[PDB]
Amino acid sequence: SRLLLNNGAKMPILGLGTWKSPPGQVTEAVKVAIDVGYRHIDCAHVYQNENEVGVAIQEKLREQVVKREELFIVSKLWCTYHEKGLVKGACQKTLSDLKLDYLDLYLIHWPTGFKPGKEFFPLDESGNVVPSDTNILDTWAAMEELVDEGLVKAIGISNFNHLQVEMILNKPGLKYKPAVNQIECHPYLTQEKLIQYCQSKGIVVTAYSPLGSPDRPWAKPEDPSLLEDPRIKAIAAKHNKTTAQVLIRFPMQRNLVVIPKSVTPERIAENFKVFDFELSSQDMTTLLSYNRNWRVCALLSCTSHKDYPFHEEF
Ligand SMILES: NC(=O)c1ccc[n+]([C@@H]2O[C@H](COP(=O)([O-])OP(=O)(O)OC[C@H]3O[C@@H](n4cnc5c(N)ncnc54)[C@H](OP(=O)(O)O)[C@@H]3O)[C@@H](O)[C@H]2O)c1
Numbered sequence: 001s002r003l004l005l006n007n008g009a010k011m012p013i014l015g016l017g018t019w020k021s022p023p024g025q026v027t028e029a030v031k032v033a034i035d036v037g038y039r040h041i042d043c044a045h046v047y048q049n050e051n052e053v054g055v056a057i058q059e060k061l062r063e064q065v066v067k068r069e070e071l072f073i074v075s076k077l078w079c080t081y082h083e084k085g086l087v088k089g090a091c092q093k094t095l096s097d098l099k100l101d102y103l104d105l106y107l108i109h110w111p112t113g114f115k116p117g118k119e120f121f122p123l124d125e126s127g128n129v130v131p132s133d134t135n136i137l138d139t140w141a142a143m144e145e146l147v148d149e150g151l152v153k154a155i156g157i158s159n160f161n162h163l164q165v166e167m168i169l170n171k172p173g174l175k176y177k178p179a180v181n182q183i184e185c186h187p188y189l190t191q192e193k194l195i196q197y198c199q200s201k202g203i204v205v206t207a208y209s210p211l212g213s214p215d216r217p218w219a220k221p222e223d224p225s226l227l228e229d230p231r232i233k234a235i236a237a238k239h240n241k242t243t244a245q246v247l248i249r250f251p252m253q254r255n256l257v258v259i260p261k262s263v264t265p266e267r268i269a270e271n272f273k274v275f276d277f278e279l280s281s282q283d284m285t286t287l288l289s290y291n292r293n294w295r296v297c298a299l300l301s302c303t304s305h306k307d308y309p310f311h312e313e314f
Pocket residue numbers: 016017018019020042043109158159182183207208209210211212213214215227242244245259260261262263264267268270271297
């Protein structure tokens with residue numbers, strides 16, 4: 001039900017994702033999620049909906065449905081806020097929108113730093129992303145002081161390859177180890193190597209886009225669909241479960257935290273009924289063989305950035 005982090009905290013294995021959840025639909029989505037039993041919400045400043053998520057969290061807290069210590073709220077530091085003096089400000093903005101006084105986990109969204117400004121993806125006269133000269137080590141030192149100031153209980157990373165995680169772990173004077181590395185993971189991108197590396201170092205892995213993210217704005221009609229994969233449909237039918245329930249249970253049995261996104265009440269409910277069954281070792285090994293190394297989030301606009309994470313094997 002919950003995984004132990006290196007800071008002593010317990011992180012709920014199942015969480016509700018909020019990327020692409022419209023401002024006018026997410027408040028109700030989070031309210032239903034909390035009613036259904038979700039105790040973990042994944043957020044980010046760049047999703048442009050934290051205020052509305054915060055409205056839901058505030059209502060359930062006032063209603064006595066849950067107490068703050070029961071919830072595990074996660075947010076992420078965007079690329080345009082990597083410089084030393086901007087990290088605290090970004091964290092505080094997220095805290096005010098969510099209407100909380102601390103986050104359970106704060107992640108560096110991407111290892112790539114962009115030029116500070118109002119645009120999430122700053123462009124030059126040529127049209128490409130403008131990089132910041134900041135590095136991963138300096139941004140990490142700024143995240144560490146957020147822990148020292150009481151703004152966040154744990155800090156982590158997202159979309160960091162193994163060498164980038166290595167840099168943080170080998171940093172002179174390292175005070176706090178990354179608690180979590182949130183990466184893309186599903187049957188078409190199994191990440192066996194990165195997952196084995198992180199887990200050996202005591203870093204919890206959170207699998208995002210577990211259903212293949214069928215609502216990504218860059219979707220194409222010829223792209224493979226996990227939910228419609230006949231091979232996965234067969235495993236689901238063998239268990240009297242839906243394909244989504246199988247795709248959510250899959251990472252859980254690999255000791256990964258999973259965060260499926262949904263704004264639909266019946267689906268939020270369906271995605272929760274994943275604790276009452278088990279996939280056999282055969283089902284697990286079969287699902288792992290479906291790997292194609294297909295990424296939903298490849299951050300293609302930053303392929304030339306000095307800290308682009310996907311050039312290395314893992
Ligand atoms: N750290 C990062 O860089 C990063 C990147 C990507 C995602 N994430 C996080 O991961 C979360 C989940 O990933 P994601 O949003 O990419 O997509 P996902 O969870 O893989 O898929 C979401 C899509 O699947 C649909 N869906 C949900 N449950 C379903 C069900 N039971 N049956 C059929 N369809 C279902 C949703 O539809 P409805 O909503 O219409 O129900 C939505 O269209 C994100 O919201 C975000 O919080 C993090």
